[PDB]
């Protein structure tokens, strides 16, 4: 087993997707290209086509540095927000695997409270 491990941290909100690779410790990040700078439209920042384009750019950089395999940790916005991973999470996780990188230990790391502070809207909701 000569694989060298990184940690691919994927932040999938409904506004943008983050693909972020560090080493085993969270310091010394390797590559981080967001979904919002592969398409310049300000509304397709969370699109799955944007997230897979970003995920190829991490894998091209991770191959250059030397990282061959990765542990992927995926999160949603969390806290008092939606807790549902955005549309870019599934495309970015898939596109890392087809790029030649190896993958192990998929884990959900969405920050989930213990009935913490208040939320959007104010008791009548964001009404539309």
């Amino acid at each position: 087993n000569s694989q060298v491990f990184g940690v691919a941290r994927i932040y999938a909100s409904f506004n943008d997707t983050f693909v972020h690779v560090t080493d085993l410790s969270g310091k010394e990040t390797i590559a981080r290209v967001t979904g919002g700078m592969k398409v310049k439209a300000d509304r397709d920042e969370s699109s799955p086509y944007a997230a897979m384009l970003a995920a190829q750019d991490v894998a091209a950089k991770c191959k250059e540095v030397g990282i061959t395999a990765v542990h992927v940790k995926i999160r949603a916005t969390g806290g008092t927000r939606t807790k549902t991973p955005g549309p870019g999470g599934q495309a970015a996780l898939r596109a890392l695997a087809r790029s030649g990188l190896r993958i192990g230990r998929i884990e959900d790391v969405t920050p989930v409270p213990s009935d913490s502070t208040r939320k959007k809207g104010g008791r009548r909701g964001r009404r539309l």
Binding site: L24, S25, E28
Partner: protein, 216 residues
């Protein structure tokens, strides 16, 4: 215009001898310069590693161990035990409807001055002929179960060190000890110790770290 990746080393992460696969992985740091070393930049990193990867077996796929870097010597760094946590997949899967979630925790120090907070979890269950569909426990049973769990979780850490605690967190001897002491109150399926946290550490006492390492 700098290309900062061609100035970094690679350091091997070494697990303590309480685990089998002592080679965890490799980590980066910058080149040591004038009044900026690499030892002080690596001496606080915490590495999260699955207990399945430390032991090799897939039975420990749902537990992770925090490992904190303490000493660097000769292009590999020696880690110590920093904390154990459960994965979010299993911790959210054992929480099912139509059963009672029982949680007990305690804060206690080891034989060496290692203040830890230990978290335990337990769940009620039906037993093989139950027709009713929830099998809840009364509040007096949960208070009686918590008193037994907290007594076992306290009396065990009094007569052990951090190395002795880590050795017996692997074969689930605590969960069998909780089960044999609470089976006369409720059936109590799915007993686990779900988290230990490092509250206060003692002095560095490097020989205790070298005693944990130094093989292979």
């Amino acid at each position: 215009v700098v290309d900062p990746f061609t100035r970094k080393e690679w350091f091997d992460i070494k697990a303590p001898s309480t685990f089998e696969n002592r080679n965890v992985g490799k980590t980066l740091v910058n080149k040591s310069t004038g009044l900026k070393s690499a030892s002080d930049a690596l001496k606080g990193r915490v590495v999260e590693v699955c207990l399945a990867d430390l032991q090799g077996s897939e039975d420990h796929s749902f537990r992770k161990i925090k490992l904190r870097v303490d000493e660097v010597q000769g292009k590999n760094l020696l880690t110590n035990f920093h904390g154990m946590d459960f994965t979010t997949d299993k911790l959210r899967s054992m929480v099912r409807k139509w059963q009672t979630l029982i949680e007990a925790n305690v804060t206690v120090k080891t034989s060496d001055d290692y203040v830890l907070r230990i978290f335990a979890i337990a769940f009620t269950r039906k037993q093989a002929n139950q027709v009713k569909r929830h099998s809840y426990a009364q509040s007096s049973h949960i208070r009686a179960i918590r008193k037994v769990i907290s007594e076992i979780l306290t009396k065990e850490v009094q007569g052990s060190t951090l190395a002795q605690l880590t050795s017996k967190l692997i074969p689930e001897v605590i969960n069998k000890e909780i089960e044999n002491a609470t089976k006369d109150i409720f059936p109590l399926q799915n007993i686990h110790v779900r988290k230990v946290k490092l509250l206060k550490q003692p002095k560095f006492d490097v020989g205790a770290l070298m005693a944990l390492h130094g093989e292979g």
